[PDB]
Symmetry: D2
């Protein structure tokens, strides 16, 4: 009984999404129980990629806190070199991390991986900085869309190819604030591209 005129259907309710986030966080806590994480000196660093991941991250890190996984939050932001071309997957860095990741355990946090061109690019970039470990967690995975092989370590949910909006995800910087992940109506998409 959350309803949206602009959406064909709902894919994931807030609650479904929170349940999966809890499951992903449990797994993470488990995979890192061996690594002796500690606040200040050795937290799991969450490199959250803006804007899309801002919501996922806010929910994810509280779920992580529930499993006593201590975390350091970093926020980066990158922008497309508006080509369409790019097989390097290259993006423009607009905000890089405040602290060194070297020797720390890092988790890159992203909202959507389809092509993985950009995630792969950012994985490689942060890998060459010699963190103790480096893994990826993604809100949505659209494996159908890969142009470079890449497996996220953690996945909240899989999706097919559609205009996916909400829960931080946007169409034209709109609809990020929805509590649910929903499928944008093609008519709404078409009407907005005319404008």
């Amino acid at each position: 009984p959350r309803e949206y005129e602009f959406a064909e259907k709902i894919l994931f309710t807030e609650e479904e999404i929170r349940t999966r986030i809890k499951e992903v966080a449990k797994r993470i806590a488990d995979d890192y129980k061996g690594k002796g994480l500690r606040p200040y000196v050795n937290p799991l660093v969450l490199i959250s990629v803006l804007k899309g991941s801002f919501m996922f991250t806010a929910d994810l890190c509280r779920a992580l806190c529930d499993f006593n996984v201590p975390v350091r939050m970093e926020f980066i932001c990158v922008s497309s070199y508006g080509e369409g071309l790019t097989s390097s997957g290259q993006v423009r860095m607009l905000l890089d991390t405040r602290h060194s990741i070297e020797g720390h355990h890092v988790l890159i946090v992203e909202d959507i991986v389809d092509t993985a061109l950009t995630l792969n690019y950012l994985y490689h970039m942060y890998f060459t900085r010699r963190p103790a470990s480096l893994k990826t967690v993604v809100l949505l995975d659209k494996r159908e869309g890969r142009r470079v092989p890449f497996s996220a370590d953690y996945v909240v949910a899989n999706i097919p190819n559609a205009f996916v909006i909400g829960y931080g995800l946007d169409y034209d910087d709109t609809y990020r604030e929805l509590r649910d992940i929903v499928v944008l109506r093609p008519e709404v998409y078409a009407e907005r591209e005319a404008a």
Copy 2:
């Protein structure tokens, strides 16, 4: 329950209750203003790092009230002065879209001195939004060194090591669901 914490100021639930009230208050203030998606959203300029969690919950609460928003994130850092009287900060990351002619709400985590907030407000004003307001998670009014009234306040506090819900000590404890008071012992160590 938290070993490093003197006490719990606000539980997650209290916090979400206040945020819903603030959200309703905003929805009421902007109903005359004709907000519309794409063309006229309320722009939230969320100041990193401390406001990230507040902003995630706040924009969802605003969505419950059919307030269409646009999310922008900016990031500033301190110049290594003991303390500055202009409230100047270094711009690391700035809005993606122009704010000219839009309704803008700046979202901050904590306001004490307001020097920084006043500087940002003034900067954002000269950019000619249709209107500008600020919402803050925690107001420490005791602390002001410049005159500044937040339009929306989630909760007032005294002076204290306040951590949790996005707020840090040495980039630690931002992940907590509650806002809590640090032990001075843990601070000293």
Copy 3:
């Protein structure tokens, strides 16, 4: 002499430009001899706006050194929000200064001022940071084009409205490396606007 197929004419040779840079610098030295400038503690801070000013700045600060004016270089960079053009003059900050300007003597260095919408925006921004003083120097002044009143304190040269290129100035990020400031042929402009289609 240098020659260029893509240019209607030369407006300023390298040597013409260096002479005016020297004259400007002498003036700056003279205006600040009273202010007790000193290296490390109290230099004249040059806020150089990229990309356009890079070459101007490199030449200007050597000239300033010739008149014993100690300087600190800062480089900022900003980008247009893709509004055709806006009345606030607002731009996006991509790179801000490394050190505080509070209490320092600051000179903002720009390549071209026409509307002054953006330079006014940047003057105001740095002014509210409370430097000891804040002035502007511009390579080229197109006073004809103002949409906000604004007077640069120092001007290397005035120009009329033309595609001005060279000496750091670009068309489509091309021709910045020229030693001279020249006028781009409208035919070349038209050929290039069609081409990215």
Copy 4:
């Protein structure tokens, strides 16, 4: 003449002579490559701060040899170590255009350990330029902690406090026309402050 300087390593004029030589060498290396303005320029990624003055002169000299260029500037800063083995740095400002498919020349002021330069090279490489070289103003090869050869070098130096021509000490002396050696006394006195 400069009171704060033991000696002059290179005069402005010597520097311009070397830069002209390096520029010729580049113009020769890329003649087979079909550089053209707008569509296929040699992209100079000039690293701020210290390379600003070199970059200004170098691109003018390159223009003398009809080498079409695109100027990009990047700016990075140190993470709070003494130093680091990955040679990582923090990205503050990045290129405006993509470097995919272009010929790229990275322009640096000074290479000692090469850790930073090695990291930038590698990052830029993964961006798939058609080709990638580096040109440096001063090479301090004695100091390498990772193997790296600059393709173009304006001048080699020993180990010294080197200042001028864009190179600084505590963000001072970048404006000098010559490259000069700092007096250690001047160094000690300022460290005090």
